[PDB]
Structure formats: C-alpha cells, structure tokens
Ligand binder design. Structure first.
Ligand SMILES: *[C@@H]1O[C@H](CO)[C@@H](O[C@@H]2O[C@H](CO)[C@@H](O)[C@H](O)[C@H]2NC(C)=O)[C@H](O)[C@H]1NC(C)=O
Ligand SMILES: *[C@@H]1O[C@H](CO)[C@@H](O[C@@H]2O[C@H](CO)[C@@H](O)[C@H](O)[C@H]2NC(C)=O)[C@H](O)[C@H]1NC(C)=O
Ligand SMILES: *[C@@H]1O[C@H](CO)[C@@H](O)[C@H](O)[C@H]1NC(C)=O
Ligand SMILES: *[C@@H]1O[C@H](CO)[C@@H](O)[C@H](O)[C@H]1NC(C)=O
Ligand SMILES: *[C@@H]1O[C@H](CO)[C@@H](O)[C@H](O)[C@H]1NC(C)=O
Ligand SMILES: *[C@@H]1O[C@H](CO)[C@@H](O)[C@H](O)[C@H]1NC(C)=O
Ligand SMILES: *[C@@H]1O[C@H](CO)[C@@H](O)[C@H](O)[C@H]1NC(C)=O
Ligand SMILES: *[C@@H]1O[C@H](CO)[C@@H](O)[C@H](O)[C@H]1NC(C)=O
Ligand SMILES: *[C@@H]1O[C@H](CO)[C@@H](O)[C@H](O)[C@H]1NC(C)=O
Ligand SMILES: [Zn+2]
Lengths: 119, 898
C-alpha cells in the first residue's frame, strides 16, 4: 500500500498595504516523493490512497479541481497503473490547483497532471 | 478695515498660482504637550497678473518657522528678481498669510515662495487631521485629510479658491511600516528617510490642473482589495485590515469600476487618471468626499457585510459611490467658478448618482426614489420665504460660514430635481449629449451656470428639439429665483394658474426676483390613467382643453413627478381621484399616489385645500401594499406627530394609524413566515420595515410582542443575532423603549464592542428611544465624550435624543444653556437647530427661540444662520396651523379611527 499526497500551501504578502484578494505572494505546492528530473510518480501498489493537504485560513482555501480529467483527485476505481506529476505528462489529464478567496477571486497556482493505463 | 485687501474675504486678482510642491510629515504619537502634530514645507510658483506690493495667500492654524527674519522666503524665476520682504503677518478672520513687500512685483513675471510650517493633527475632521480605531488592544492613529470647502489652507499655505487651479507635487514622510496615499500614484518606491531610517519618503506624480479642495493625503496601516476596471483604471478599496479581510469592502469593489466606466461611456468623456482609490475612514464628517483619485468615505457609506448590513445600507453604499464617482466629471474635471454655483457640482452628482446606481443594481429601480428622497425633501424648505435660489449671486457668498451653509438641500436635492426635469422635457440622450460637449470644452477649467445652458442649447439645435424658448430663459426661472410654483387646475374650464407656493400664506417674501416668481413649466398629464400630450405653461394663467374634463373623467398633472412643482385641483376632480383610489388605486401610477398624498398635505398647510381632504387621501392606504405611497403618507404625517405628540390629539391619531396599518402588518406577517424571510423585491422590503415600524409605533400589540420577543431572544444568545438586518433599526428602538435598564445596557455594550459601523449606527439610534428621562440625560452626556461616541456622531446622536418626545425638553434646555460653550467646538449647528425646533408650535416656544437668537446674536450662528431664520418662520406658521386645525384634526382621527 502507498499514499499519494499533494501538499498545497500559500501565504499572502505581509502588510502594510497588502492586497487581500491578489494572487498569493508565496506558493508552495509539493507532491510527496516526487522528483521533477526523474518524472511522473507512478503507482507501485496493489491499492493506493490519495490525500489532499490544502491550506485553509479565514476565507482563503486551497483546492484541486477536476479539470479535463474523467475522474477527480480523491474519488479514484480500477487501474492498470496510474502516474502523478507536477509537470506535463503528454497524453494525460490536468487537475488545476486553485487558491480561492470565498465569494471573490480564484487564482490558479499550479497544476497536477495524471496519467493511467486501462486494467 | 475693508479698505485693506487682507481684511476682505475674496482673494485679490493680482496673483495666480501655477504649480505647488508640498512635503508633509504626520507625527502619529503625541508630543510632551499632548498634541498630535504635522510638520511641512511648501513652494508655490505663481504669476503676477497685476503689479502689487503684497502677497496674500490663505493660511489657517499653521505656525511658521522663521527664515531670515520672516515666515517665508521669496525667490525669482527665470531671471525675475523679487523685492525684499518688509514683514509678514497672519490675519485670522480672513485666514490669510500676508507678505508686505518693499517693492512691487512685475506684471507677467513668475515668483516662488518657500514656507516652513507646523500644525495640529486634531480630531476635528478638517484639514490634515487624525482618525483612530482599535486593532486588538492597540489604538491605531491615521493621518487623513478633508479640504472642502476651505480647509486646504489648514494643511499648507495656498491660494485656496476653486478657480485658482494648479498642479501639485506631493511628498509624504511617514513611519516605515505605514503606507502613504495621495491623488496620484507614487513616483517610484518609498525610500528611507536618510536622516532617520525609521521613516520613509513617498513622492507622488504631479497632479493635473486641480482645485486645492480636492487634494488628499493619507498615512495608514490599511489593507485593500483591487480590481482593474474595464476602462483600464485600477480600483482599490482601502480600509482597516480586519474589515478588508472580512470582505466588507468586496461590494464596493464589485460596483465601483463598472459605475466609473458607465459614466465615462454615458458622457463620452474618459476618466483621465490611472487609478481611483476608495478609502473608508473611522472618523469623517460628511458621507464621503470626491478627492480626485483618492475618494474618502465614512465607513457606513463604503463598507458592507452581507450577513449583518441591511438592504438600505447596501443602497447607501452604491448610491454614495455613484455620487462620488459622478463628481469626477462634475466637480473635479469641470469645477465651479465660486461656491455660489455649488449646484453645478452637487446638483449633478445628486442626480447622476441615480443613473450610476441604477446601472449597477438595475433590479432595484432606484430612480423612482428620487421623488421622495430629493424632490419632496427639498420642497419642504424651498416653500419658505427664507429659502434661497439654486444660483445665489456671487457677491453674497464670501465667508467660510456662508460657503458651508450652501451644502444644503437646495444645492443637492433641488439641483437634482431641476436636472430630473431638465433631462425630462429634453431626452436623457439629448441631455447627455449637451453635457458631453460641456465637459470637453471646460475640462480642467471652471464654469458658471450660463456656460451649461449654452452647450445644452447646442444639443437642442443639433437634435432639432423644439422648445418654447431658449434653454437659458427656461432654466433661469428655476435657477436664479428661489422656490417653485403650485399649478392649480380647473377641470371645468381647462384653465391653469401658477403662483409662488409658500407653506404659510402670511410669510413675507423679501428676496426680489427678476421674473416676479413666474416660471416656464413643462407639464405632463394623464387622463383616466392615459398620458396626454405635453404642454408648456409660459404665463401666469392659460387655458387648454388638455385639462378640461367631462363626466367621470379625471386628470392628473406631473406624471411620475418629473417636474419641480405642486398641483392643486378643483373640488370635483379631487373627489373623482379619491373615488378612484377607493375603487381601484392601481389605475393611478404608484409615484402619483405619493404625489396625491404629499401635495394635499402641503396644500392643506398653505390653506389651499381643507386638511380633511389631505387626510381623506390616506383612507385607501389600508389596502395599499407599495412602499412609496405609504412612505409619502408617513412623512407628511410626521409633521402631525411633531405638532401633536405632546397633546390629547396623539391618542386618536395613533388609533387611526393602528387601524390603517394593521392589515398590512398582518399581510407581511404571513408573507414572511412570521418574519423568517424578507421580500425579494427591494421596495417591498422597505414597505415591510415601514409596516413594522408604523404598527409598533402606534400600538399594535402583536408587533410590540414580536420586537420585544426577538430582542430578549437575542440577549439570551448574544453571538447569534436572530433579527434580520432590515428589521434591526425598528426592533432595537422599540425593544429599548418597551424595556428598561437591562435592555439599554445590553445595547450599549453591543455598541461599544461593535466591529461593523452599520450595526453601531442602528444601536446608537435605538439607545435614544429610552422612555427613562434619567437614561436620556446620561446618554446626552455621552454624546460629547469622544471616548464613548465619536465626534463624527455627536450631533447625529443628540438629534436622535431630541426626536424622542421625552428628549425634546432635555435637548432644547441643553442647547439654550450651552450654546456659547458649544459653539467653539465637526459639529453641525445647522442640523441641530432644525431638529430641536421643528416641534415648536406655541407662542412660549417662539419666545424662547427669539430670546435664544438675541442671547447669542453677536457671537453668531455661523453655518446655522439660515436654519435659525427658517426655524422662526416655521414656528410662527406652526402656531397658526395648530390653532386652525387642532379641533378639525382631533375630530377627523376620532371618527375615522373606529
Ligand atoms: C512640480 O513638478 C513638475 C514636474 O516635475 C515640475 O515641472 C517641470 O518644471 C521645470 C521647471 O523647473 C520644467 O523645466 C519642466 O519642463 C517641467 N516639466 C513638466 C512635465 O511640466 C514643476 O516645476 C514642479 N513644481 C514645483 C512648484 O516644484
Ligand atoms: C412612470 O413610472 C413608472 C415606474 O414607477 C414606469 O413604469 C415602468 O415602465 C417600464 C417600461 O414601460 C416597465 O418595464 C416597468 O415594469 C414599469 N414599472 C412599474 C412599477 O409599473 C412608467 O413607465 C413611467 N411612465 C412614463 C410615462 O414614463
Ligand atoms: C513546502 O511544503 C512541504 C509540505 O508541507 C514542506 O515539507 C516544505 O518544508 C515546504 N517548503 C517551504 C519552503 O515552506
Ligand atoms: C532528483 O533527481 C536527479 C536526477 O536523478 C538528481 O540529480 C537529484 O539529486 C534528485 N534530487 C533529489 C532532491 O532527490
Ligand atoms: C501654534 O501656536 C499657537 C500659539 O503660539 C499654539 O497655541 C498652538 O498650540 C501651536 N500649535 C502647535 C501644533 O503646536
Ligand atoms: C520603507 O523603506 C524600506 C527600505 O527601503 C522598505 O523595505 C519598505 O518596504 C518601505 N516601506 C513602505 C511602507 O514603503
Ligand atoms: C461581488 O461579486 C462577486 C462576483 O459576482 C460575487 O461573487 C460576490 O458575492 C460579490 N460580493 C459582494 C459582497 O457583493
Ligand atoms: C453641434 O453641432 C456642431 C456642428 O456639427 C458641433 O460642432 C457641436 O459640437 C455640436 N454640439 C453638440 C452638443 O452636439
Ligand atoms: C372627507 O370624507 C368625507 C366622507 O367621510 C367627505 O364627505 C368629505 O367631502 C371629504 N373631505 C373633503 C372632500 O375635503
Ligand atoms: Zn457631492
């Protein structure tokens, strides 16, 4: 068994005169056990569990959208082999990562890419 | 005295400024004398238009550092050689700094004047002043500005008249942890002050040619939200960090940009600046101020909480923003020549505000509310002999008190109403075309009223509009003479008659009129609910079959009250109107049902119809559900309350109102599921509030039980308010009046710990509804303690107390006792006089008012002078009105109350 953990954190610019609804000045998106120069983190499991660890303070919150993906992070379901990355996987899906200000702006701050085979 | 120029209130024509540079440094901690102060310097470059041996410039409450023995240094420009200074002096009454020269300045040459000065960052809400608020356990101090009309001189020396436009180079020295803001964007990033790194220096780009009264300097720890408008302009909503984080500036951001570009497109005139900052201050005298690029607001005119603010608060926010943004064109780009024409600024803003607000919230239909909130609001004062024309002669406006006095219902609401009518006989598209030319031609300049007629005539001609005469001759009748006409219709003949309407026939009109109080009136009409052709009344008396009737026919004049006049009818037409209101009032437009009510009550006061006719017009209200007709009746009858709520007549009147409103109250009780929902339509929301307020105020037991129940439920769960914000003003006030010390204390603590000014305002007003005289006396002492009630809310709270029948004698005694002490020290002496005297209806009260005038005559009443004269005129009319109507009214209420 193995967990697939996507960490999403962001911070607003410090005052004075901070723009509360602007795109967060600091953004830290980490996919656990992923190295950009080795490529997609693919599944080595008989079963795996996805965990989303998004920041939430006051009206600000992080979320991962479904994007152009037949599934959603969390609700994944049979697999041949599924791969995850924070860089483009040609032939896969793109799950947008957003920083959302409740009832105001939403900001795209990253992208999770998923790939899979049938089985 | 008057022989010397420095003892006269208007600046000489000898010097004209070209460009200023100003550096200001607020000290947000008190000094060893206990004062918050600001230090500044300034250089003004000016041109000598006419040779003179004196420099007269405005200066108010500024202490100057002497340089080479004098308060200023004078230098030459491009070869010019300035004479030596003989001496400088400060002339306090005219607020001048006077530099007496040993030689004469040379015509057409330029000069530069350096000064170094200090002033107080007082809590007086004028000039460069301070505002405070709590963040945690820390009291934050803000440096901010308010220059209109004549307080720019209080922050630095300047030629402080709106027609002395100039460019300004602002520099602000501020603590390093604070942001500095001004009209323009900063000219580079904020640098540390070399002398002291704990301070930074922010220099701002040069402003456009501008009036001094539109400058703004702010130093604060505020945050903001931003959004770029669809016309390129950057919008930012600034406020306390907690308010921004909570989202209380989000609604302002949603509407500000769109309204700005709507105005730009509507008048075919771009907004020439790259940004427009909206900032809400904790301490602020007026509602807002249109400083070019840095619009300042009362928190309750800009901030909005969706869960705790009411729909009426929401309307206020979008309306004031629209008002301030309209000023960017009518006021900032094109400015009045002198304050006597103030309506060119405030009349247009008070009219255009409805177009901008309607664009932002098209479902509300706010433009209809202009008849209640502007037209009939100002007709109350414009029907006095002591009113004044929209455009006063410039010779008559000189002192700061005279100037402040004209920020009144004439310059605002009447100006709006004549524009509403002007924009009605011509189309809004013809109107806006004429204004587009007016704005383009006079950009960065100053105008008088005749300049506007010319460009409206250009539009009339290009669009082939046929008027009875020139725009000039039509609109001068509504601009150069005070008041308005009453159009009396005789439907048996079809004859029309106009005359100056005066609330008291015996009032003495002393102001002469070059038109002998005759107007050119555009008259619309409906016949049995069907609009007829327009007609122009150009003489005192006319005849036309458009106003003749046969059989069951009835006619009404002034459709949707677009024109600024009142209408009276022959008895028979009135009767058919009343029959129509009883059979099916929907046949009469909603606005004209309000007209029928309001006109008759005012006509009755003027002894032009029987008071019983006006009261009979309120009988159909028991079946009326719309907001406007009910509000017209409640407002007209507030005069009856003022005259009778201390007499035996109040009982019968309350029973009548109880009868009339109870079905409506029960209707809303059903329509809302016992008050757990609010109507979807905005006007229906306001009619619900008035139904609850009227029912509770006149003794409907169900409403009294409801409001005290809701309030007690709240005290048992303080952190979960069960009262919808729309009902809070009414529920709070009635629960306070019905309760006692426990309810008053609970609301007082809620007011002290308030995080939202909208909520504090409602609590502040409801605390004045206490029935305990000792509580009202204690509350009165709070209003003058700045640590308990902000100075910006002092007079407003005192007015809430005087509106309480138990508070009337307390406040009047207080005003008589403390006027001399009061007068020195932000405080609307005019509004308070208006409020504390409107109940006067006896010779005894008139005696006190007369003695009040004599006892304080020499000290003066400042911007309350007209208010007092109008109080005397109204008090004398009230005496006659009560003697003539008391028994009639008492009997009418008793009979129609069963
Ligand atoms: C305010 O700032 C403006 C812009 O920096 C100054 O205008 C310049 O004035 C100098 C004369 O010293 C001219 O040579 C430049 O051509 C001007 N530039 C522009 C763009 O007009 C202005 O002099 C400053 N005023 C004061 C009182 O300091
Ligand atoms: C008089 O004012 C009323 C509004 O109080 C106008 O009524 C609206 O007219 C528009 C377009 O005809 C309709 O879409 C609205 O539903 C109407 N509102 C109401 C409340 O009826 C009316 O048109 C005005 N009369 C004139 C001649 O302009
Ligand atoms: C980014 O987030 C990861 C996961 O929460 C954390 O381990 C890491 O320290 C963070 N990096 C920075 C620079 O904050
Ligand atoms: C990531 O992979 C590259 C290529 O193998 C390697 O050079 C680099 O050191 C790795 N970084 C980490 C943090 O493992
Ligand atoms: C300016 O001088 C006057 C008179 O000397 C004094 O009363 C006032 O307090 C001074 N203002 C400041 C800010 O020190
Ligand atoms: C003040 O200056 C310092 C140093 O240049 C800078 O780091 C800081 O951001 C400045 N503060 C403001 C409010 O501009
Ligand atoms: C402002 O508009 C946004 C976008 O339509 C809306 O989601 C939001 O609720 C509005 N905010 C307020 C306070 O009106
Ligand atoms: C009227 O027409 C003339 C000539 O076409 C034009 O110069 C002027 O700007 C027009 N005025 C208005 C208000 O449209
Ligand atoms: C008031 O109503 C009565 C009927 O109750 C009517 O006789 C009278 O004419 C009305 N007053 C008028 C029309 O002034
Ligand atoms: Zn205004």
């Amino acid at each position: 068994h193995m967990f697939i953990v996507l960490y999403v954190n962001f911070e607003l610019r410090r005052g004075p005169g901070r723009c509360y609804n602007c795109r967060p000045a600091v953004v830290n998106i980490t996919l656990a056990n992923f190295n950009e120069t080795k490529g997609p983190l693919c599944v080595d499991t008989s079963h795996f569990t996805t965990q989303f660890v998004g920041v939430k303070f006051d009206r600000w919150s992080a979320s991962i959208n479904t994007g152009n993906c037949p599934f959603s992070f969390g609700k994944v379901v049979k697999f041949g082999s599924v791969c995850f990355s924070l860089k483009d996987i040609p032939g896969g899906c793109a799950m947008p990562i957003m920083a959302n200000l409740a009832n105001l702006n939403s900001h795209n701050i990253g992208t999770l890419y998923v790939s899979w085979s049938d089985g | 005295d008057q022989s010397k120029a420095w003892n006269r209130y208007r600046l000489p024509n000898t010097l004209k400024p070209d460009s200023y540079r100003v550096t200001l440094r607020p000290y947000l901690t008190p000094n060893d004398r206990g004062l918050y102060v600001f230090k500044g310097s300034s250089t003004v470059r000016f041109t000598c238009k006419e040779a003179t041996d004196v420099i007269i410039i405005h200066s108010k409450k500024l202490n100057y550092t002497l340089s080479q023995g004098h308060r200023v240094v004078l230098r030459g420009v491009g070869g010019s050689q300035p004479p030596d200074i003989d001496k400088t002096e400060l002339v306090e009454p005219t607020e001048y700094l006077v530099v007496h020269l040993k030689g004469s300045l040379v015509k057409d040459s330029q000069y530069e004047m350096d000064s170094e000065f200090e002033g107080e960052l007082a809590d007086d809400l004028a000039g460069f002043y301070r505002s405070e608020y709590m963040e945690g356990n820390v009291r934050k101090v803000v440096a901010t500005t308010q220059m209109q009309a004549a307080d720019a001189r209080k922050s630095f020396p300047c030629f402080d008249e709106p027609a002395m436009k100039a460019e300004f180079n602002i520099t602000l020295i501020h603590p390093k942890d604070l942001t500095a803001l001004s009209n323009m964007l900063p000219k580079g990033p904020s640098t540390p002050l070399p002398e002291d790194p704990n301070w930074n220096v922010t220099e701002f780009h040069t402003t456009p040619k501008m009036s001094t009264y539109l400058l703004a300097f702010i130093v604060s720890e505020f945050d903001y939200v931003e959004k770029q408008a669809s016309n390129g302009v950057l919008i930012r909503i600034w406020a306390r960090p907690s308010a921004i984080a909570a989202g209380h500036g989000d609604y302002a951001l949603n509407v500000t940009g769109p309204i700005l570009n709507f105005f730009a497109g509507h008048y075919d005139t771009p907004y020439p600046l790259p940004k427009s900052d909206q900032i809400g201050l904790p301490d602020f005298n007026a509602g807002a101020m249109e400083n070019w690029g840095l619009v300042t607001y009362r928190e309750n005119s800009l901030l909005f909480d969706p869960l705790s603010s009411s729909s009426s608060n929401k309307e206020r926010v979008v309306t004031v923003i629209a008002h301030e943004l309209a000023h960017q064109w009518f006021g900032n780009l094109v400015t009045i020549e002198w304050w006597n024409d103030l309506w060119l600024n405030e009349g247009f803003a008070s009219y255009v505000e409805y177009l901008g607000a309607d664009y932002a919230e098209p479902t509300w239909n706010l433009k209809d509310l202009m008849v209640l909130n502007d037209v009939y609001r100002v007709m109350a004062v414009d029907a006095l002999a002591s009113s004044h024309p929209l455009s006063t002669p410039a010779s008559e406006i000189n002192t700061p008190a005279q100037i402040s006095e004209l920020f009144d219902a004439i310059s605002y609401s009447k100006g709006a109403s004549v524009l509403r009518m002007l924009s009605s006989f011509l189309s809004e598209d013809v109107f806006k075309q004429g204004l587009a030319s007016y704005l383009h031609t006079f950009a960065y300049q100053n105008t008088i009223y005749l300049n506007l007629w010319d460009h409206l005539q250009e539009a009339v001609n290009n669009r082939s509009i046929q008027l009875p005469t020139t725009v000039r001759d039509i609109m001068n009748r509504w601009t150069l003479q005070m008041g308005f006409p009453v159009i009396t219709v005789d439907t048996s003949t079809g004859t029309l008659s106009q005359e100056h309407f005066l609330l008291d026939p015996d009032s003495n009109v002393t102001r002469p009129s070059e038109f002998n109080y005759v107007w050119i009136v555009p008259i619309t009409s409906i016949r049995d609910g069907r609009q007829q052709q327009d007609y122009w009344l150009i003489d005192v008396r006319a005849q036309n079959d458009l106003f003749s009737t046969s059989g069951n026919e009835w006619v009404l004049l002034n459709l949707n009250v677009t024109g600024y006049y009142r209408v009276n009818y022959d008895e028979e037409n009135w009767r058919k109107i009343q029959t129509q209101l009883q059979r099916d009032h929907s046949a009469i437009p909603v606005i004209n049902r309000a007209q029928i009510i309001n006109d008759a009550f005012n006509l009755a006061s003027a002894h032009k119809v029987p008071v019983t006719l006006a009261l009979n017009n309120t009988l159909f209200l028991i079946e009326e559900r719309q907001y406007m007709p009910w509000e017209a009746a409640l407002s007209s009858l507030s005069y009856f309350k003022l005259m009778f709520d201390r007499s035996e007549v109040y009982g019968p009147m309350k029973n009548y109102l109880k009868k009339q409103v109870t079905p409506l109250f029960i209707h809303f009780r059903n329509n809302t599921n016992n008050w757990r929902e609010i109507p979807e339509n905005l006007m229906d929301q306001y009619s619900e509030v008035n139904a609850i307020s009227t029912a509770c105020s006149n003794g409907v037991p169900e409403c009294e039980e409801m409001v005290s129940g809701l309030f007690k439920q709240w005290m048992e769960n303080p952190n979960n308010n069960p009262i919808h914000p729309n009902l809070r003003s009414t529920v709070y006030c009635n629960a306070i009046a019905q309760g006692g010390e426990e309810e008053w204390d609970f609301a007082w603590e809620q007011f002290r710990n308030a995080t939202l000014v909208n909520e504090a305002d409602k609590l502040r007003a409801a605390l004045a509804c206490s029935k305990e005289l000792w509580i009202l006396n204690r509350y009165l002492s709070y209003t003058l303690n700045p640590d308990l009630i902000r100075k910006q809310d002092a007079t407003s709270t005192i007015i809430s107390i005087t509106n309480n029948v138990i508070g009337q004698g307390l406040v009047w005694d207080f005003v008589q006792s403390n006027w001399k002490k009061l007068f020195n020290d932000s405080f609307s002496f005019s509004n308070l006089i208006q409020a504390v005297t409107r109940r006067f209806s006896t010779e005894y009260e008139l005696q006190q008012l007369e003695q009040f005038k004599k006892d304080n005559e020499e000290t003066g009443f400042g911007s309350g002078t007209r208010a007092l004269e109008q109080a005397l005129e109204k008090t004398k009319a009230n005496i006659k009105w009560v003697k003539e109507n008391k028994e009639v009214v008492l009997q009418w209420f008793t009979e129609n109350s069963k």
